[PDB]
Each structure stands twice: as C-alpha cells, then as structure tokens.
C-alpha cells in the first residue's frame, strides 16, 4: 500500500476522487507547522510550501463537498464523513496552542468544514424547494414546496439517517435547511399588502397544512418531534394575519347575506310564485343564508380551532343583523305588495323559513336559550305579522256572525255557530301549503280566536235571564257549542288543550243555581285560566237575573287570583277586556 510520496502523486489521487490519501493532505500542513517551528527554513520557501498545502486543501474540499451534495454516489462517503471531521477537529487543535503561526504563513485554521456542509445542504434544499412545478403562483409555490420537503425529508430518514454518523445530525440539518427556506419564502410574502384569498391560503398553510400535513401526519412524524421546528411566519405576525382575515371574511358573509336578502326581497317584489316541496319553499333565504354561514365557519375552522370560535361569536352579530333587516323587508313587503297573485303564497314561504332557522341554529351554535331567543327575536315578529296578515280576512268575515249571538239574544246558537264553522272551514285549504309545525301553530290561533270571541259575546252584558229554566237551556246551548268548536278544531289540527274547558266550565257557572256550587266552579275555573278576573266573573253573573249579594261573595274568590308559586297563564282573559 501507501503512502504517496510526491505531492504531484497525491494531487493526482485527489483529482481521481480517491480520499484514502486525504489524511496525508493534513499531514503536510502539520509537517509544515513542524518545519516552520524548527526555525531553520526560508520564508521564501515557507510561502511555497504553504501555497502548495492550501492548493491541495482546496482540491480536497471540492472533492468532499462534491460527494456530499449528492450522497447517492457510493460507499466512500464514509471517507468524506471521516475527512469532514478530521479537519473539523483539527480546527480545535490549532486553536490558540497550535494557534501561533510564524509570520509569512498567514493563518488559515478555523476552516469550519462542517459549516461548509451545512451551506451545501442548505443550497440543495434551496435548489429543490425552488424548482418549477393555477390556484395562484403563491399557492402553487407552497404546493410544490410542501411536497418536495415531505418527499426529501422522507428520503433522509429512510436512507441518509443510517449512513451519516451521529455527530452531524443529518436530519436536523436537512429539515432545518428546508424549513428555514420555506419560512423565508413566506417571510417574503408577509412583506406585502396581500389579497384576501392570499391571506387565507398562507394563513391556512402556516396554521394547518404545514404543521399537520407535512411535519406531523407522515412517517416523518416521529423524527421531527425531536427537531422542534417553529412557525413559518412569526407568532405576532400570524396573530395580526388572523385579525385581518377575520375582518375580511366577516365582511364577506355580511355583504353576501345582504345580497341574498336583496334578491329574495325582489322575488317577492316580482310576484315570483314560490316552489313547493310539500308546503312552500322560499327556504332559498333559509338554506342560502345558513350556507353562507357554514362555509365561512369552515374557512375559519380551517386555520385554528380558535380562529373558528372567534368567527362564530363574530358571526352571531351579523346574523342578528340580517334577520333584523329581513323582518324589516318582509314587513315592508306586507305593507305595500298585496295585489300580487302570490302575496299570501309568498308570506307562507317566508313564515316557513323560521322552522329552518330555529332547527339549524339550535344545533350549530349551542347557545343559552335566552341568547338563542335574543338572536331569534325578529323571526317571531315576522311570523307574527305573517299569521296576522293571512288570518285577518277570516277574522273579519267572522266579525258579524258573532254579533249574531248577541243579535238573536241566543235564540239559536247552533245555527249561528254552524254558520261560523262553515265560514272558517272554507279556509282550511290554502293553509295546508304551510309547514306542519306552523299549521298547528296557526290552528291554535284560530281555536283561541273562536273561544275568545265567544266569551266576549257572553260578557257583553246584553242578556239577563230571569228564571233558572232558561239559564239551564242556555247552558245546554253553550256546551253544545263548546263541543262543536273543540271537536272541529282538534279534528282539524289544533292541539290547544288548555282552551277546552273554557266554554264548558262557564256553561256550568251559568246553569248552576245554588251559591256554593257557583263558588266551587269559580275556584276551579280560576285554576284553569287564572287570568280570569272579577270583571269577567261579573259580566257572566250578569246573565243570572237571580242572586244579588251572593255576587259579592262569589267575587271575593277571584279577589286573590294571586299565585306566587308559578305564573304560567297562557293569555285568554288577558285578551278579553270588558268594563
């Protein structure tokens, strides 16, 4: 075997790549250091010998790096490792102890070859991350980048991790060399007034795609946990990016909802017949609105959980906004358009929407029920004004045929009432084009109106009965009617159970002839419907013609309808004021 005598030979060996001889190249330098410190040696010779050393050492370098740029060369990469350490520690040798250099020599010795390597790893991490791979130039850049880095670090943990010794940290050096390059190309875009779409794609990337899809979800996963890389953009700048993105998107859905509303507004305006699933659908506004919201919420869920929650609490306010300005536009629709062929039809479509809002917002937001109801307020107002507007026409046709109980001094109830049932049942049809929930919600309204109206008639102090027999006859009448109403309404979709004992129980107060009895049906009747007051008790006893100072007694009951335990009176007598 060797060594190699002439420096010519050695140079020739380096030139043919062979690095057994790398050790000799250092030996020379060491020898020079020797021959110098022997004193006896020309300066004119020192310079010669040193120029030759450092020239050889340049060559050696370019061979080692030449190998390590593309570690797919062979197995004398162990050689290149060995040398990229011999010189690395020789650096430490000639610190300040080998550090005296006789002049004419020119110090060269912190050579820092491992650092050179890092420079190359980094320069290759930047040749590859920068190759030419569209959603955007930016998003295509990020794509190609993330891909390339996942790929390449996968290669390093797969193949370069067993070849490199522990001193170098192959892995840390590679991931960090790529990582920092990524973060550089991002820091570059941060120095810009960027588009909204751009803000979202880079925020997504930093916050979600990078650390999950690349750093964490692969097989790389396990390794880089050790590395502990940071963000791409810096913390403060990321939080700033959030803060502006929110305002972007929140503004997007604000404007978009606004436009949805405007457009449906004109559908009404334009006498568009709504389309019918089973009851009418203008759920156009319903689902189109909730879709705007859901997609915004996804977009801000697709960064952080916290970006998400922030945009939720932030969207509540603009939803409130919309609903409010919706009620207003529907109301204005009511007030003006009316001749329109699909005025009532439209109304029903809109009323229908409330079901979907209730249903979807109860599941989506998970808010307190007073917060829920606080948001949902102007939908009741819309459904209120809705119902009031469709019904209004039948409540009028019904206005005289109730006077006719008073007009005929209750001569024949059942005929008058049958006229009313006819006049109401001739309205059942179109109200079937209305959501089932609201169907029965409206039936309670009609039911209630029939009962209120009846009790308003009996309380009009416009019939006094002289003798028990006709009070019993009147009772039989009332009861007949109460069974007609309760039956028909229940049978047509009302579930207003509370109303059922309204009329029958009054018939009983009319019919009952003995004092105590009347006191007891009064007690019980205040129990069902406790908004029943002395006012009504009077107007009812007015139709009694006997009993004059048992009035005082029967009334001193009602005198304390005061609960204090629970106050849940569904309005019945609240709504019937007679003085």
Residue numbers in the entry: 67 to 199, 205 to 650
Q: What do the study authors state?
A:
To obtain high resolution M-Sec structural information that might provide insight into the mechanism of membrane protrusion formation, we determined the crystal structure of the N-terminally truncated (residues 1–66) M-Sec at 3.0 Å resolution. Although we could also crystallize the full-length M-Sec, the N-terminal 66 residues are disordered and the corresponding electron density could not be observed. The structure consists entirely of α-helices and intervening loops of variable length, organized into a series of helix-bundle domains. Particularly, there is a remarkable resemblance between the C-terminal halves of M-Sec and yeast Sec618 (Cα r.m.s.d of 3.0 Å over 278 amino acids), as expected from their high sequence similarity. The domain arrangement of M-Sec (domain A: Helix 1–4, domain B: Helix5–9, domain C: Helix9–13, domain D: Helix13–16) is similar to that of Exo70 and adopts a straight rod-like conformation. To test this possibility, we introduced two sets of mutations that would decrease the overall positive charge in domains D and E: One set is a quadruple mutation K531A/R532A/R533A/K537A, and the other is a double mutation K470A/K474A. On the other hand, no binding of either M-Sec mutant to RalA was detected in the presence or absence of GTPγS or GDP, while the interaction of Sec8 with RalA in the presence of GTPγS was unaffected. These results suggest that the positively charged surface of domains D and E is responsible for the interaction with RalA, which is required for subsequent extension of the plasma membrane.
We recently discovered that M-Sec, a 73-kDa cytosolic protein also known as tumor necrosis factor alpha-induced protein 2 (TNFaip2) or B949, plays a central role in inducing membrane protrusions during TNT formation. M-Sec-induced TNT formation is accompanied by actin cytoskeleton remodeling, which requires the association with RalA, a small GTPase, and its downstream effector, the exocyst complex. We identified a conserved, positively charged surface in the C-terminal half that is essential for M-Sec interaction with active RalA and promotion of TNT formation by extending out the plasma membrane.
